[PDB]
Write a protein that binds this DNA or RNA. Structure first.
Ligand SMILES: [Mg+2]
Ligand SMILES: [Mg+2]
Ligand SMILES: [Mg+2]
Ligand SMILES: [Mg+2]
Ligand SMILES: [Mg+2]
Ligand SMILES: [Mg+2]
Ligand SMILES: [Mg+2]
Ligand SMILES: [Mg+2]
Ligand SMILES: [Mg+2]
Ligand SMILES: [Mg+2]
Ligand SMILES: [Mg+2]
Ligand SMILES: [Mg+2]
Ligand SMILES: [Mg+2]
Ligand SMILES: [Mg+2]
Ligand SMILES: [Zn+2]
Ligand SMILES: [Zn+2]
Lengths: 247, 85, 106, 140, 98, 72, 61
RNA sequence: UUAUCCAUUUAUAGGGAUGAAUU
RNA sequence: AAUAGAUCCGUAACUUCGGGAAAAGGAUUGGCUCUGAGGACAUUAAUGUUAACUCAGAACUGAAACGGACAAGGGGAAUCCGACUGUUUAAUUAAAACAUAGCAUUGUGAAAAGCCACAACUGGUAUUAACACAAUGUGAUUUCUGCCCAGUGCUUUG
RNA sequence: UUGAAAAAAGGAGGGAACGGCUUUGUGCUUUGCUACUCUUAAUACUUGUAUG
RNA sequence: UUAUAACAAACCUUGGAAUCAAUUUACUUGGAGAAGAGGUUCGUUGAACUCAAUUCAAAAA
RNA sequence: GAAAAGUGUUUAAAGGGGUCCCCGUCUCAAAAGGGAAACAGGUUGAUAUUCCUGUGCCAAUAGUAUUAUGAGUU
């Protein structure tokens, strides 16, 4: 038959991200001598909306320790940060909302965001509006730290890995119903063209495993193996259980 | 004369949209549109500009907050913990 | 009424091609393309319009006299007066505080 | 008490002398049909002596250390008084005179003031903190 | 308890004595030497607070960091507007000076 | 186009060697009004003398190497 | 047309039958309100200037 | 760890204890 | 075909209390001649110069006529389907089809992950990071979603 | 849904550098003298024919 | 830079506001300084305004 | 990759600005985005903000030497 919707996506044509209006990538500071041995202070000069995001960014300006000039970075804004607030980043930084510290230097229970999964990664985990990771332990041999991601998953990362004390701004955005179709239209219009979503069951056979039939029904189990191929991964991929989640 | 009894701010939506959904929107709308107390000037002038941005008409200071309320409880808790530490 | 028409190649109602209907000595009503209103040069800090500087487009700003581009303070036509004052205060007060801190330490 | 004493150093906050430091000479504090504001009357430095290095030759050093002064009457609400006071190091009455502000040869007076400042800078004394502060161009 | 005491003192001052509230007036008072003690709200904007402190130092005056917000400082006086910083220029029966 | 009011300034302009042409116009006013135009390389300066005799005198004064245009 | 205008001025043509737009379209309620308020406010301003009214009274009114 | 692979930046200090900041 | 514009009246069942609703159903409307209501100024509370157009009311009038042409809803009582605005078979199908918000499920903690693309190297999602992205199903709300894992799937331990 | 970018231009911070001529020694240093540094416009002259 | 005048703003000086005030069609704003009194600027506008000049007569430097 | 082609910093010794340092893929892509500066009258059988008359505006304008124009210094 034909190429399914999903398959089309990968070539990225009309299916690339809508990148034009975005302010730029959100990234932590480069991991310089400063950040590794002491702290460096910056100022959030403005907090600003990024289109495809649900969380505002903070433009924070730093002084280059190696060259005369100010340099502007793009952080994700933690809740409670404000314009003209001072941000401190480094091994020997103090533990306040907004600052950026190695996970090793925060007592357990601390709440962090924009976490690097390896050191230097410029921040990778807990970025979406509302989310945070919690420090749940530091190994007695040191070196690693144990964190709990918004999913529930526990992961062990390097203590040298950086993070930002506090929670990401714009929380509870998902609490409000997207009452109208058009408001969702507007939302995805700034991400990528994954809206309208036709049901495979509403398609013809050429178009989808689910396609066709006199009655509009799936016709076969809709749980597909991990070891399926491109046009078979169409329903509930690799589903370990199904039905209303009781656990 | 007070126009709506239970509807309030959701009078713009009218008859359409589930009533339950409208009720929820109402709370959220209220949260959004209330002039919050600015923790700098003191004047209740902080209003929502974007999703997580809250600007004051007094200071022009943009404070990062929650999507609908200026402070989500979790964030407050986190702050408190930090303070205690 | 006397009907008019565009004369400057661009025949679309764009922000740059905004038009003012003008009467001529010949009696004919003619079209004149209005030069766009430039945004007022605003402060480096609070982004509020700076006085003393004429709001002119990058083209018109080059021909204009230096008096229409500059204010005679320190940071001049880049920072409003209040902000300048604030900066000055910061420079002094902070410095003073530093000294005090040093004294305390010693 | 009365913070603005004749001789104390102050930082101008407003006008063409934006962030300049100066010494007040005669405080008036009397509103009139003329000046409906308490005003200070101040002699200050507009152009500070540029940084100098030991290796440099004497004439060039001297040139570097030339100070361009100014004398201005200014509303007290526009000056920040400092803890630093130069009552001793400067014979203040000699610097600025009320009558001379009105006088034609104001430029000459200014020049004289500048010269005096330069001289003071040259001969430190023992060494006052206030004078050092005055010397150091304010960075903002 | 301390806060309560402070409030009481403020009230007393209001009842009997001479005070003036708000930045510029306070500054003027300080300049004069008329100020006996200044009280600064928690939320008073940093630079201005610093300036006030400096002024106080210059006049060998007390600075009193009022524990509560701008709004409170105002509610603390008989006023329905926020105050920020005030200057006692004459204490009545009140003790706050000592 | 420029208007002139200081007679002296006008005279000075006239004295200046980039002034090739002059114009003198007569207008029935709503008496005889007279416009004195000087045509410089860059600008055309014009003076309105309400008083005929004065205008005449000024014209007389004007250098006789000027290429005077009597418009009406 | 001039005659018609004259008639209208004397109130002749105007009448329920000669009306096609709603009352608001005929003469906008909002505009009327604006007029009225501005008239009143101007008067108030005048009165206070004359000292004929005291500020407190003015404000309440 | 040297092959290899991944990341990071201008490949920018060997390890430990709401101003300014340059010749 | 009838209905229709506007002003004044009058407005039910039911309802998610927002609507229904212009509900239904009435009445009035021309022309002429008047009357009242609504400003701006500027003189000194009276006196002036003067501006729109809009209201409201009263006479008289006519072959009882008047939104005189033009323009301009038929309405109601119900039942079935879809909630709704939207989209679609260009040239036989405009829908009860699709979408939709909402609900639910599943996978994935990352450059050795998820889903997809590419002959290959490389790439997209991704200037992304679980309030995310990908993949399904159902289709606002209200009220609920029983039982069955033998069969076929998917999946977990070795 | 927060609603382009750059060319180009401007402002500010910052304080590098510093008058001309003549003589002497190896651009630099020393000595003596006082109209100098700018800036428009015009003009004259060489250099390829110096306004579109 | 058309000269000015007028006006919506923004800012400055003075002034110190509960008997809350100023204020818009709307709300907005005010001890982080309101009203009021005097100003400055940008922007509209592009001869408005006595704008300019002239006619002379009186008062200062 | 057999090539044709497919990718565009993934392990580059990738021209400019200052007085050796500091920057830096190139190039095309808008006759509705950005952008140096023009208007009026007149004129032809047919062109006109393009010709003519008049009035302007914008960008250039090497070096040396004179000149005038005013600044600043002494
Ligand atoms: Mg869906
Ligand atoms: Mg669907
Ligand atoms: Mg089908
Ligand atoms: Mg199939
Ligand atoms: Mg079918
Ligand atoms: Mg179905
Ligand atoms: Mg209304
Ligand atoms: Mg439908
Ligand atoms: Mg068809
Ligand atoms: Mg459907
Ligand atoms: Mg349903
Ligand atoms: Mg079931
Ligand atoms: Mg091109
Ligand atoms: Mg164009
Ligand atoms: Zn605020
Ligand atoms: Zn500012």
């Amino acid at each position: 038959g034909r190429v399914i919707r999903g398959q089309r996506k990968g070539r990225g044509s009309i299916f690339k991200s809508h990148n034009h209006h975005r302010k730029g990538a959100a990234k932590l500071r480069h991991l310089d001598y400063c950040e590794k041995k002491g702290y460096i202070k910056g100022l959030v000069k403005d907090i600003i909306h990024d289109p495809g995001r649900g969380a505002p960014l903070a433009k924070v300006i730093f002084k280059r320790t190696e060259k005369y000039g100010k340099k502007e970075e793009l952080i994700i804004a933690s809740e409670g940060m404000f314009t003209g607030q001072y941000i401190s980043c480094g091994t020997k930084a103090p533990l306040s909302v907004g600052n950026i510290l190695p996970i090793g230097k925060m007592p357990e229970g601390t709440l962090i965001c924009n976490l690097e999964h390896r050191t230097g990664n410029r921040g990778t985990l807990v970025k979406a509006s509302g989310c945070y990771a919690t420090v749940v332990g530091q190994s007695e041999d040191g070196k690693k730290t144990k964190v709990r991601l918004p999913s529930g998953a526990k992961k062990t990362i390097d203590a040298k890995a950086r993070a930002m004390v506090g929670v990401v701004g714009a929380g509870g955005r998902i609490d409000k119903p997207i009452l109208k179709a058009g408001v969702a239209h507007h939302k995805y219009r700034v991400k990528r063209n994954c809206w309208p979503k036709v049901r495979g069951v509403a398609m013809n056979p050429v178009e989808h495993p689910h396609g066709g039939g006199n009655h509009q029904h799936i016709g076969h189990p809709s749980t597909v193996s991990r070891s399926a191929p491109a046009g078979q991964k169409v329903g509930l991929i690799a589903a370990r259980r199904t039905g209303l989640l009781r656990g | 004369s007070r126009r709506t009894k239970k509807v309030g701010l959701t009078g713009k939506y009218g008859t359409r949209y589930g009533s339950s959904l409208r009720k929820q929107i109402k709370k959220i709308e209220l949260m959004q549109h209330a002039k919050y107390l600015c923790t700098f000037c003191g004047k209740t002038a902080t209003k929502r500009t974007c999703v997580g941005i809250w600007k004051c008409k007094k200071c022009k200071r943009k404070v990062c907050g929650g999507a609908w309320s200026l402070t989500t409880p979790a964030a407050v808790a986190a702050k408190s913990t930090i303070i205690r530490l | 009424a006397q009907r008019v028409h565009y004369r400057r190649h661009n025949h679309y109602n764009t922000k740059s091609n905004k038009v003012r209907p003008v009467r001529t000595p010949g009696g004919k009503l003619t079209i004149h393309v209005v030069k766009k209103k430039a945004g007022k040069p605003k402060c480096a800090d609070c982004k509020t319009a700076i006085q003393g500087v004429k709001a002119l487009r990058p083209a018109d700003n080059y021909r204009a006299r230096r008096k229409n581009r500059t204010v005679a303070r320190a940071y001049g036509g880049s920072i409003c007066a209040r902000c300048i004052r604030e900066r000055i205060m910061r420079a002094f007060l902070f410095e003073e505080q530093k000294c005090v801190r040093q004294v305390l330490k010693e | 008490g009365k913070l603005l004493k004749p001789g104390k150093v102050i930082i101008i906050l407003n006008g063409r002398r934006a962030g300049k430091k100066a010494v007040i000479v005669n405080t008036y504090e009397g509103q009139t049909r003329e000046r409906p504001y308490s005003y200070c009357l101040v002699a200050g430095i507009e152009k500070h002596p540029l940084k100098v290095n030991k290796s440099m030759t004497k004439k060039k050093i001297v040139k570097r250390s030339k100070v361009k002064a100014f004398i201005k009457c200014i509303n007290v609400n526009h000056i920040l008084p400092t803890r630093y006071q130069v009552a001793n190091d400067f014979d203040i009455k000699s610097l600025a005179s009320d009558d001379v502000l009105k006088s034609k040869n104001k430029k000459k007076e200014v020049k004289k003031l500048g010269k005096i400042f330069r001289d003071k800078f040259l001969e430190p004394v023992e060494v006052s903190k206030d004078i050092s502060f005055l010397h150091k161009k304010l960075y903002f | 308890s301390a806060g309560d005491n402070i409030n009481a003192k403020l009230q007393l001052v209001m009842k009997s004595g001479k005070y003036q509230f708000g930045r510029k007036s306070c500054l003027k008072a300080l300049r004069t030497g008329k100020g006996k003690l200044v009280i600064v709200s928690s939320n008073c904007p940093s630079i201005q607070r610093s300036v006030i402190e400096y002024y106080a130092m210059l006049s060998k005056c007390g600075v009193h960091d009022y524990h509560g917000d701008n709004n409170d400082l105002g509610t603390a006086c008989g006023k329905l507007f926020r105050i920020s910083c005030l200057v006692i220029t004459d204490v009545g029966d009140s003790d706050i000076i000592k | 186009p420029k208007q002139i009011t200081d007679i002296r300034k006008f005279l000075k302009i006239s004295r200046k060697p980039d002034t090739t042409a002059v114009i003198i116009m007569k207008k029935k006013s709503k008496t005889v009004i007279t416009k004195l135009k000087l045509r410089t390389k860059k600008y055309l300066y014009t003076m309105v003398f309400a008083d005929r005799k004065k205008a005449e005198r000024i014209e007389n004064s004007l250098l006789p190497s000027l290429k005077r245009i009597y418009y009406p | 047309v001039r005659l018609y205008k004259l008639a209208k001025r004397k109130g002749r043509h105007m009448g329920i039958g000669k009306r096609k737009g709603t009352k608001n379209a005929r003469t906008n309620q909002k505009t009327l309100w604006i007029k009225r308020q501005r008239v009143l406010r101007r008067l108030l301003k005048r009165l206070r200037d004359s000292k004929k009214v005291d500020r407190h009274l003015y404000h309440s009114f």
